[PDB]
Amino acid sequence: RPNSVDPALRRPGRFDQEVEIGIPDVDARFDILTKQFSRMSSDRHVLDSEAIKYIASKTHGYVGADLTALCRESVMKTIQRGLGTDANIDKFSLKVTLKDVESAMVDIRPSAMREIFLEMPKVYWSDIGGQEELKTKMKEMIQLPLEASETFARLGISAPKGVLLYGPPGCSKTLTAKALATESGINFLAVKGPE
Amino acid sequence: FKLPAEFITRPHPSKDHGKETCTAYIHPNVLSSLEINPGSFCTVGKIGENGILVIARAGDEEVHPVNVITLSTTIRSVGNLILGDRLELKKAQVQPPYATKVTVGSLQGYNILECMEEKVIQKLLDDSGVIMPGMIFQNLKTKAGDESIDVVITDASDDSLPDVSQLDLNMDDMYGGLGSTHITFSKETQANRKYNLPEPLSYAAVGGLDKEIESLKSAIEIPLHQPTLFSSFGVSPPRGILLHGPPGTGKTMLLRVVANTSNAHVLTINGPSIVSKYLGETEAALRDIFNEARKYQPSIIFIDEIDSIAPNRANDDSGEVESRVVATLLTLMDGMGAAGKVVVIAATNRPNSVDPALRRPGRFDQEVEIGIPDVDARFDILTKQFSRMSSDRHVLDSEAIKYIASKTHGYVGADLTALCRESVMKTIQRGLGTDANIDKFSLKVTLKDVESAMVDIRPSAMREIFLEMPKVYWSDIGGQEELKTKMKEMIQLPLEASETFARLGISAPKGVLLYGPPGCSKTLTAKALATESGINFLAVKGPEIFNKYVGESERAIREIFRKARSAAPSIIFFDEIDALSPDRDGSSTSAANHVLTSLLNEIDGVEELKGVVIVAATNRPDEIDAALLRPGRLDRHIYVGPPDVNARLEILKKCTKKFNTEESGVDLHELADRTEGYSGAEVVLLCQEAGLAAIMEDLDVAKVELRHFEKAFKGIARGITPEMLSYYEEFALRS
Ligand SMILES: Nc1ncnc2c1ncn2[C@@H]1O[C@H](COP(=O)(O)OP(=O)(O)OP(=O)(O)O)[C@@H](O)[C@H]1O
Ligand SMILES: Nc1ncnc2c1ncn2[C@@H]1O[C@H](COP(=O)(O)OP(=O)(O)O)[C@@H](O)[C@H]1O
């Protein structure tokens, strides 16, 4: 945490260079899982890539450190399910499956739920709920700046940079931000009032 | 100039025959420093327990390191000398006088060894030294039918002049080839209780957590016994194992059991003695301990009270012991080796107080959870204990054990052991007082002393609780089944469908609210919920958490919530939440707002509490803050109005049960019909005040008259107006 560090250290004159590392997104998690599978080699597992995307999607707030522990506990679950059932049968045939991974992600209980910044929430347009006019308007004002910043700079008008939403406390006021974050693929900041 | 200080035991390598009793592989420098002939006896101090196990000595071949010493598995089992202990050396004592009888016990066998006997005596005493009270050897090869046999030789019939020698070792001079002293095989004797030998803790001694202990044993056995198989995967085996639970569950006992039952090296810490004033001394000691740990491949690490050794840095950064020790232990346990075979067992009373850096999937992914024993576990513990001191000293049938277990539902294994000890000592005291020095075998153990024992000892929680044993039951209360059908399912959801919630992901809202008019049955409903649940109940009320000091309310809230979390899945109840619910109305202080925000965050904020269930009771739910009156938390609302005709009749009959109905002159229905607009508390008080009116005449009476009831009705007021009932109804309509 740079905040706990003395601000004298965080001086541009000396410590100008800064590198920011965030929690992996869906693509980074998929790449990490594929690299781990390649490292542990195909002779010890039978998996397909669609299951890798499914696992990456199912992990929203998971950190990169959690994936290795999940793989290790899945290995333990497979070893136990082989031993205690088949009375010390050969482990080569059992290799790696999906049920152990599912049990591992159920019982892992990660401690990364509490955070001030969530990176790339996953929700698709086939899951959200809203009205057509709101979706069209949000598409219009997300496609205006990111695709016409140079045009606005040439015209010297910039972008409104302000959108206000008000409605019933049911839905279509909070999940819309997550939908926009998932669709646009741009960094998303969520701030809670009482927090 | 070597100056040896402390020594560590080790099993004898290569097996075979060799010495097997007096190996004592020690560098010749230590032999010369002790000024004693190497071809003589040696001693192992082992700190305390005088007797020092005087065994003969032998020299090594100059490669055996000075620090480590070999005591052989036979002596290790004889004296319960576990691996990693500290030992001291001193001059030998006087030579043993002689051996008189020596008698075998035929451990865990049906005896009848004559077919496979083959002159066991030569096999027993083909060795130098050999302390008579202890010989434990492998079966080796005995005729056909292989199998395994062990012998108990603890019992002895001789005495030695010095009281220091605890096991009174004896010399050997008999005859054997490849006749004794009046034979040695007689009876299947167990370990002798006269000398009070330290009984090894068997793996079957602990019970009621068979699934948990089996999972822990497998999780610690698969890395050690299968290191290559796990290393083939390339994911590497973790070293951290977390043990936690309520106090008195016996986690230290199971740690001792697994240490004794494992032949691999075990290491444990002796508490805060490692912590010292010098900053570098503790680091050097930890580094040396870790070095000795991974120097030998099979090693077990035992950690106790990790919460005190490694407190949370955020909670209190007092200094000295701080996050630096957490970091150094994490670095030490991160990379001792690639595959290796190392497991670390950490026991903590409060997992929350532990540093969250320790509680991470990268270092402590595997956790073991221990809860309060249930009826079956307590019954198993009691049966094990009774088998432990044998039926020769007590008589108790299975139904009696089940009844005792059912009566003591809030106890723990430590509580049961203390109950047995207090029952034994009270029985001894009663026998001494009454029977005038009778043999203790005749009186043995009965039921009355044990019942008085659980009556007197009281549960170790030392907090006020109904416990459902001496308090109101379901038969004593007559109400409406409509709310009962709801609450039974509502509180059977979490206790019975935790796996269903985990699999489906629906989980539990954990929010239930009960609103009732003053004088109605609201606390009665809470008591009924607690009774039917059969789980520990915490009696918490609104103003109780409030205090004059600023911030004390938050401390009390955190205390009660971490107590409820560690008190198994239960229900937390607030008697009067109306004292803190309204903040906008009445100009509440900042403390009330802070408490409301804290409880809002605790119920369904940032974290979810699967174990406990939150139930709240308010005198008036219309002034509650809109933040709490939100769907998802405390959403369920039950009107639970005044008792109807049948409930009022049942309540009157229960009150009249102490009286006599035949001579009362009432039909138990006219009174209920007349008393229809009164509150439940007023209805209950009506019977008592009418009884007072009846006894007004001549103190103690046996007859009640209608004039007394009329005077009772005239002299009291309901105190309930239709306006508040209409307001309560409007609360239901508006929601
Ligand atoms: N379930 C049980 N069955 C039989 N005896 C038990 C049980 N639980 C406790 N005991 C007895 O109580 C003693 C206390 O156990 P132990 O020292 O392991 O306690 P603990 O819960 O780990 O707590 P602490 O570390 O404070 O001692 C045991 O040595 C044993 O004699
Ligand atoms: N049938 C009954 N027998 C004995 N006591 C009762 C009975 N019904 C209710 N009570 C008592 O009346 C009290 C009800 O409190 P209640 O009036 O609901 O509080 P509030 O006024 O905050 O709503 C309980 O504490 C309970 O002990």
CSV table of C-alpha atoms in Angstrom, one decimal, chain A residues 26-167:
chain,number,residue,atom,x,y,z
A,26,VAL,CA,-11.3,-12.5,-17.6
A,27,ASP,CA,-8.6,-12.6,-20.4
A,28,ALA,CA,-5.7,-12.5,-17.9
A,29,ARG,CA,-7.3,-15.2,-15.7
A,30,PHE,CA,-7.8,-17.4,-18.8
A,31,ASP,CA,-4.2,-16.8,-19.9
A,32,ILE,CA,-3.0,-17.7,-16.4
A,33,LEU,CA,-5.1,-20.9,-16.3
A,34,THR,CA,-3.8,-21.9,-19.8
A,35,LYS,CA,-0.2,-21.3,-18.8
A,36,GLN,CA,-0.6,-23.3,-15.6
A,37,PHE,CA,-2.2,-26.2,-17.6
A,38,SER,CA,0.7,-26.1,-20.0
A,39,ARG,CA,3.2,-26.1,-17.2
A,40,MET,CA,1.5,-29.1,-15.5
A,41,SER,CA,1.4,-30.8,-19.0
A,42,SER,CA,-1.5,-32.6,-20.8
A,43,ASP,CA,-0.4,-36.1,-19.6
A,44,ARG,CA,-1.8,-35.4,-16.1
A,45,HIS,CA,-5.2,-33.8,-17.1
A,46,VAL,CA,-8.1,-34.0,-19.5
A,47,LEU,CA,-9.5,-30.5,-20.0
A,48,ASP,CA,-11.0,-28.4,-22.8
A,49,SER,CA,-10.7,-24.7,-23.3
A,50,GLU,CA,-14.4,-23.9,-23.1
A,51,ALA,CA,-14.2,-25.1,-19.4
A,52,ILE,CA,-11.3,-22.7,-19.0
A,53,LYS,CA,-13.5,-19.8,-20.2
A,54,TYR,CA,-16.3,-21.0,-17.9
A,55,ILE,CA,-14.0,-21.1,-14.9
A,56,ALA,CA,-12.6,-17.7,-15.7
A,57,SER,CA,-16.1,-16.2,-16.1
A,58,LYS,CA,-17.2,-17.8,-12.8
A,59,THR,CA,-14.3,-16.1,-11.0
A,60,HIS,CA,-15.1,-12.4,-10.8
A,61,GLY,CA,-13.2,-11.1,-7.8
A,62,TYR,CA,-10.7,-13.9,-7.7
A,63,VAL,CA,-7.0,-12.9,-7.5
A,64,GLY,CA,-4.2,-14.6,-9.3
A,65,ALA,CA,-3.0,-16.1,-6.1
A,66,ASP,CA,-6.4,-17.8,-5.6
A,67,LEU,CA,-6.2,-19.7,-8.9
A,68,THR,CA,-3.0,-21.7,-7.9
A,69,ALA,CA,-4.6,-22.6,-4.5
A,70,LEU,CA,-7.8,-23.6,-6.3
A,71,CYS,CA,-5.8,-25.9,-8.6
A,72,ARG,CA,-3.9,-27.4,-5.6
A,73,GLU,CA,-7.1,-28.1,-3.6
A,74,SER,CA,-8.7,-29.5,-6.8
A,75,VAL,CA,-5.8,-31.9,-7.0
A,76,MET,CA,-6.3,-32.8,-3.3
A,77,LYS,CA,-10.0,-33.4,-3.9
A,78,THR,CA,-9.3,-35.6,-6.9
A,79,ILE,CA,-6.7,-37.6,-4.9
A,80,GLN,CA,-9.1,-38.1,-2.0
A,81,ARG,CA,-12.0,-39.1,-4.3
A,82,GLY,CA,-9.8,-41.6,-6.0
A,83,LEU,CA,-8.2,-43.1,-2.8
A,84,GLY,CA,-11.2,-43.3,-0.5
A,85,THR,CA,-13.4,-44.7,-3.2
A,86,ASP,CA,-11.3,-47.1,-5.3
A,87,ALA,CA,-8.9,-48.2,-2.5
A,88,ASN,CA,-5.6,-46.8,-3.9
A,89,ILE,CA,-6.3,-47.1,-7.6
A,90,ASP,CA,-3.9,-45.7,-10.2
A,91,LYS,CA,-4.1,-41.9,-10.3
A,92,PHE,CA,-3.1,-41.7,-14.0
A,93,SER,CA,-6.5,-42.6,-15.3
A,94,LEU,CA,-8.3,-40.2,-12.9
A,95,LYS,CA,-6.1,-37.2,-13.9
A,96,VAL,CA,-8.0,-33.9,-13.6
A,97,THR,CA,-11.7,-33.3,-14.1
A,98,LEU,CA,-14.3,-30.5,-13.7
A,99,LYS,CA,-16.2,-31.7,-10.6
A,100,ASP,CA,-13.1,-31.2,-8.3
A,101,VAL,CA,-12.6,-27.7,-9.7
A,102,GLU,CA,-16.3,-26.9,-9.1
A,103,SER,CA,-16.0,-28.2,-5.5
A,104,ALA,CA,-12.8,-26.2,-5.0
A,105,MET,CA,-14.4,-23.0,-6.2
A,106,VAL,CA,-17.4,-23.6,-4.0
A,107,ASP,CA,-15.4,-24.3,-0.8
A,108,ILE,CA,-12.4,-22.0,-1.4
A,109,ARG,CA,-14.1,-19.0,0.3
A,110,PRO,CA,-11.7,-16.3,-0.9
A,111,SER,CA,-11.1,-13.2,1.2
A,112,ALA,CA,-11.0,-10.7,-1.7
A,113,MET,CA,-14.7,-9.8,-1.6
A,114,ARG,CA,-14.0,-6.5,0.3
A,115,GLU,CA,-12.4,-4.0,-2.0
A,116,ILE,CA,-12.6,-0.3,-3.1
A,117,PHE,CA,-12.1,-1.1,-6.8
A,118,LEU,CA,-13.5,-4.0,-8.9
A,119,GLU,CA,-12.0,-4.6,-12.3
A,120,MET,CA,-14.1,-5.8,-15.3
A,121,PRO,CA,-17.4,-7.1,-13.9
A,122,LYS,CA,-18.9,-9.8,-16.1
A,123,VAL,CA,-22.5,-9.3,-17.2
A,124,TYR,CA,-23.7,-9.7,-20.8
A,125,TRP,CA,-26.6,-8.0,-22.6
A,126,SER,CA,-28.5,-11.4,-22.5
A,127,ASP,CA,-28.6,-11.0,-18.7
A,128,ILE,CA,-29.3,-7.3,-18.1
A,129,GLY,CA,-32.8,-5.8,-17.7
A,130,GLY,CA,-33.9,-2.4,-18.9
A,131,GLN,CA,-35.8,-0.4,-21.5
A,132,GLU,CA,-34.8,0.0,-25.1
A,133,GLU,CA,-34.5,3.9,-25.0
A,134,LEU,CA,-32.1,3.8,-22.0
A,135,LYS,CA,-29.9,1.3,-23.8
A,136,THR,CA,-29.9,3.3,-27.0
A,137,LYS,CA,-29.1,6.5,-25.1
A,138,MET,CA,-26.3,4.9,-23.1
A,139,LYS,CA,-24.9,3.5,-26.3
A,140,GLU,CA,-25.0,6.9,-27.9
A,141,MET,CA,-23.2,8.7,-25.1
A,142,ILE,CA,-20.6,5.9,-24.8
A,143,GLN,CA,-19.9,5.9,-28.5
A,144,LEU,CA,-19.7,9.7,-28.8
A,145,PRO,CA,-16.5,10.4,-26.8
A,146,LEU,CA,-14.5,7.2,-27.3
A,147,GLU,CA,-15.0,7.4,-31.0
A,148,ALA,CA,-15.0,11.2,-31.6
A,149,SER,CA,-12.6,12.7,-29.0
A,150,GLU,CA,-10.4,14.0,-31.9
A,151,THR,CA,-13.5,15.5,-33.6
A,152,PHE,CA,-14.5,17.2,-30.3
A,153,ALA,CA,-11.0,18.6,-29.8
A,154,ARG,CA,-11.1,19.9,-33.4
A,155,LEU,CA,-14.5,21.5,-32.7
A,156,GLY,CA,-13.5,22.6,-29.2
A,157,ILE,CA,-16.6,21.3,-27.5
A,158,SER,CA,-15.3,18.2,-25.7
A,159,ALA,CA,-17.9,15.8,-24.1
A,160,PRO,CA,-20.7,16.3,-21.6
A,161,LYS,CA,-18.9,14.1,-19.1
A,162,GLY,CA,-22.1,13.9,-17.0
A,163,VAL,CA,-25.0,11.5,-16.7
A,164,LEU,CA,-27.5,11.4,-13.9
A,165,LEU,CA,-29.8,8.4,-13.3
A,166,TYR,CA,-32.9,8.2,-11.1
A,167,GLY,CA,-35.5,5.5,-10.8
